[PDB]
């Protein structure tokens, strides 16, 4: 369970990288 | 345009969400290989005989580690500085026993990160920018080189390179203090001035700009909405910030020039960390920290201890205990 937990948190973080980069709110110039 | 010309245009395109570029052409596969091998090893690699004495050390999660203790373990002392790619092993099992993953990962990573630096130059060139962000990046990069490549070269073995793990990092540090008295080395001290100072100035700058934000919002909204991306006006009053800081110390201690100030912000930690890297890289050839062991002596000749001698006792503990089965002769000469 420990290993599963560590790897799960890591995996969620990588997924988060993906959304933060490709599905960020686009910067817009005013 | 021909296929190669089109390909070049795409590679060097300023319109890709992530810039590729020619450095990127090397960076992307090497970083991917280093990353993948690292994740798989950290989760599932079997114990590795780091010190070449058939005493395998367990680094991976599945073999009894958590996040804090786990590591990808440096290659065997028996290998020394020999090149040990997968195809030099008789089998993947041998490869794993001898710490092959470590070499694959650090070589692919060092190449990839070097190309990362190059890529910072390259995109700065494509965007019409000034080029020296990559020079700032050269500091953490040089440090990486110091602990993964140079120190191993100097000591004659990748088994002495920094382990890819948290506790392994601490191991590297303590053995380093034992064998080089790095705390008493002025380049490490400059490194500490670099990161302590970097933190200080980070906080200082952050707080000074935040203190002088021009009022653009109400109390029920975040002040951040008072800045709009790409607006031409500066978002804070630097004359007010300078009035403040100049009065905090005295006037000529403070920067009125934003360019000068930001250059300072870049230069202090970068130079400090350059010296940290050079510290590791020169203790790599056993030019060590200051040794004032028994430097103070009384009229008869009795040793009068200083704090240096207490440091020496601690270092002695580290020295005599580290790699407890690896030494057969009285001097630890590497």
């Amino acid at each position: 369970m420990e290993t599963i937990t560590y790897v799960f948190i890591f995996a969620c973080i990588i997924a988060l990288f993906f959304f933060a980069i490709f599905f960020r709110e686009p910067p817009r110039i005013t | 345009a021909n296929l190669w010309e089109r390909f070049c245009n795409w590679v060097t395109s300023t319109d890709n969400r992530l810039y590729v570029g020619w450095f990127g052409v090397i960076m992307i596969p090497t970083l991917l290989a280093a990353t993948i091998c690292f994740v798989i090893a950290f989760i599932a690699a079997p114990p590795v005989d780091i010190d070449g004495i058939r005493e395998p050390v367990s680094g991976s999660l599945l073999y009894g580690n958590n996040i804090i203790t786990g590591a990808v373990v440096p290659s065997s002392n028996a290998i020394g500085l020999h090149f040990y790619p997968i195809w030099e092993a008789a089998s993947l099992d041998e490869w794993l026993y001898n710490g092959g993953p470590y070499q694959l990962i650090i070589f692919h990573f060092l190449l990839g990160a070097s190309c990362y630096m190059g890529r910072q130059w390259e995109l700065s060139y494509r965007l019409g920018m000034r080029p020296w962000i990559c020079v700032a990046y050269s500091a953490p990069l040089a440090s990486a080189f110091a602990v993964f490549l140079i120190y191993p070269i100097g000591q004659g073995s990748f088994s002495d390179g920094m382990p890819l793990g948290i506790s392994g990092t601490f191991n590297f540090m303590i053995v380093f203090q034992a064998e080089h008295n790095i705390l008493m080395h002025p380049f490490h001290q400059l490194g500490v001035a670099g990161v302590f100072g970097g933190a200080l100035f980070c906080a200082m700058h952050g707080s000074l700009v935040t203190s002088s934000l021009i009022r653009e919002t109400t109390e029920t909204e975040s002040a951040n909405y008072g800045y709009k991306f790409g607006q031409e006006e500066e978002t804070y009053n630097i004359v007010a910030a300078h009035g403040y800081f100049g009065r905090l110390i005295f006037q000529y201690a403070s920067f009125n020039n934003s360019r000068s100030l930001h250059f300072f912000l870049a230069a202090w930690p970068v130079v400090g960390v350059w010296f940290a890297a050079l510290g590791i890289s020169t203790m790599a050839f056993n030019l060590n920290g200051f040794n004032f062991n028994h430097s103070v002596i009384d009229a008869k000749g009795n040793v009068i201890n200083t704090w240096a001698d207490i440091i020496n006792r601690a270092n002695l503990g580290m020295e005599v205990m580290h790699e407890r089965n690896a030494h057969n002769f009285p001097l630890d000469l590497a």
């Binding site: - | 058939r54 099992d93 001898n98 089965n325």
Partner: protein
């Protein structure tokens, strides 16, 4: 006539010398002459480990393993007395040499088996009435197998036999009994057995070569766990000489 620079890095250094296929002669033994083995070489080519069945009444077999400690396995530069006995048999008494190697092999599924591959204190004899060493000569004998780790060896919590803590210091108020086997280090010393089957003989130079099979226990981690049974097979070379 190869030099060290011809050989270094090739793996040849871990190989025993071979004899040409013409080496099918006889090396005369003068019963009035004393003899010596100037060089005994043993090159292991296979390490088999006896599986440990669950019913304890099954026929256990020796299974193959994968060597993971590379070309570091051969015993060589072994010398010793070669006695001519009353009944005409010859007896090799090993005196010295590079006569041990730590070896780690891996079983299917990943279990690693360290052993001290060795012929330390080998005493090995032929059949009676050996007037010439021939391709029909064989040597059979026994050797000592000392602890894989010697007495100073410290485990990862710093416990050892001739040095180290004598307890589990990270568990200051745990009950001792359950940890006795791990806390009290023991030095094993057991026997191994070996056969040498001579396959080639240069009766002119007194050189012989052939195959061997040895059997011995593996590492027992200074008494922390049971050893495994190991069977080692390979080739050997020996140079016989009037002493």
């Amino acid at each position: 006539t190869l030099t060290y620079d011809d050989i270094v890095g090739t793996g040849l250094a871990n190989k025993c010398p071979t004899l040409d296929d013409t080496a099918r002669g006889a090396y005369p033994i003068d019963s009035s002459q004393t003899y010596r083995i100037a060089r005994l070489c043993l090159q292991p080519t296979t390490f088999l480990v006896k599986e440990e069945p669950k019913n304890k009444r099954q026929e256990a077999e020796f299974v193959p393993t994968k060597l993971v400690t590379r070309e570091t396995t051969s015993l060589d530069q072994i010398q010793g007395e070669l006695k001519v006995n009353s009944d005409g048999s010859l007896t090799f008494v090993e005196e010295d040499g590079i006569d041990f190697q730590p070896v780690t092999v891996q079983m299917a599924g990943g279990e690693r088996i360290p052993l001290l591959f060795t012929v330390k204190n080998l005493v090995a004899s032929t059949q009676p009435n050996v007037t010439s060493i021939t391709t029909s000569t064989d040597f059979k004998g026994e050797f000592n197998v000392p602890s894989y780790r010697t007495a100073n060896f410290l485990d990862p919590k710093g416990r050892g036999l001739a040095s180290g803590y004598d307890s589990a210091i990270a568990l200051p108020q745990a009950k001792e009994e359950e940890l006795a086997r791990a806390n009290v280090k023991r030095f094993s010393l057991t026997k191994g057995q070996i056969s040498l089957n001579v396959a080639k003989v240069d009766g002119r130079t007194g050189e012989i070569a052939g195959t061997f099979e040895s059997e011995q226990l593996s590492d027992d981690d200074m008494g922390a766990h049971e050893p495994h049974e190991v069977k080692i097979q390979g080739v050997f070379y020996a140079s016989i000489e009037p002493a």
